């Protein structure tokens, strides 16, 4: 609902959604080809699930 | 600044917090 949402806000006024109390898997971010760029900087991508 | 949110005589109800 934050990645497949219909409308987003601008870059100067961006939407801030606090995600907590759930399961962070991120595998849909690795396998899906709908993304053009996917870069993790502070943490290795595979050590998240 | 919300960090969590959840939404679901005759009687004696005891509680411990």
UniProtKB/Swiss-Prot annotation, chain A:
UniProt-reported outcome of changing residue 7 to K: In strain: Mu/B.1.621
Annotated effect of mutating residue 4 to Q: Reduced viral infectivity
Phenotypic consequence of residue 32 to F: In strain: Omicron/BA.2, Omicron/BA.2.12.1, Omicron/BA.2.75, Omicron/BA.4, Omicron/BA.5, Omicron/BQ.1.1, Omicron/XBB.1.5, Omicron/EG.5.1
Phenotype for residue 29 to I: In strain: Omicron/XBB.1.5, Omicron/EG.5.1
Residues bearing carbohydrate: 4
Superkingdom of the organism of origin: Viruses
Subunit structure: Binds to host ACE2. RBD also interacts with the N-linked glycan on 'Asn-90' of ACE2. Cleavage of S generates a polybasic C-terminal sequence on S1 that binds to host Neuropilin-1 (NRP1) and Neuropilin-2 (NRP2) receptors. Interacts with host integrin alpha-5/beta-1 (ITGA5:ITGB1) and with ACE2 in complex with integrin alpha-5/beta-1 (ITGA5:ITGB1). May interact via cytoplasmic c-terminus with M protein. May interact (via N-terminus) with host bilirubin and biliverdin, thereby preventing antibody binding to the SARS-CoV-2 spike NTD via an allosteric mechanism.
Primary role: Attaches the virion to the cell membrane by interacting with host receptor, initiating the infection. The major receptor is host ACE2. When S2/S2' has been cleaved, binding to the receptor triggers direct fusion at the cell membrane. When S2/S2' has not been cleaved, binding to the receptor results in internalization of the virus by endocytosis using host TFRC and GRM2 and leading to fusion of the virion membrane with the host endosomal membrane. Alternatively, may use NRP1/NRP2 and integrin as entry receptors.
This protein's name: Spike protein S1
Whole-protein residues included: 340 to 388 of 1273
UniProtKB/Swiss-Prot annotation, chain B:
Sites carrying sugar chains: 1
Source domain of life: Viruses
Subunit structure, as described in the record: Binds to host ACE2. RBD also interacts with the N-linked glycan on 'Asn-90' of ACE2. Cleavage of S generates a polybasic C-terminal sequence on S1 that binds to host Neuropilin-1 (NRP1) and Neuropilin-2 (NRP2) receptors. Interacts with host integrin alpha-5/beta-1 (ITGA5:ITGB1) and with ACE2 in complex with integrin alpha-5/beta-1 (ITGA5:ITGB1). May interact via cytoplasmic c-terminus with M protein. May interact (via N-terminus) with host bilirubin and biliverdin, thereby preventing antibody binding to the SARS-CoV-2 spike NTD via an allosteric mechanism.
Role, per record: Attaches the virion to the cell membrane by interacting with host receptor, initiating the infection. The major receptor is host ACE2. When S2/S2' has been cleaved, binding to the receptor triggers direct fusion at the cell membrane. When S2/S2' has not been cleaved, binding to the receptor results in internalization of the virus by endocytosis using host TFRC and GRM2 and leading to fusion of the virion membrane with the host endosomal membrane. Alternatively, may use NRP1/NRP2 and integrin as entry receptors.
Name the UniProt record assigns to this protein: Spike protein S1
Native species: Severe acute respiratory syndrome coronavirus 2 (2019-nCoV)
Gene name of this polypeptide: S
Residue span relative to the full protein: 165 to 194 of 1273
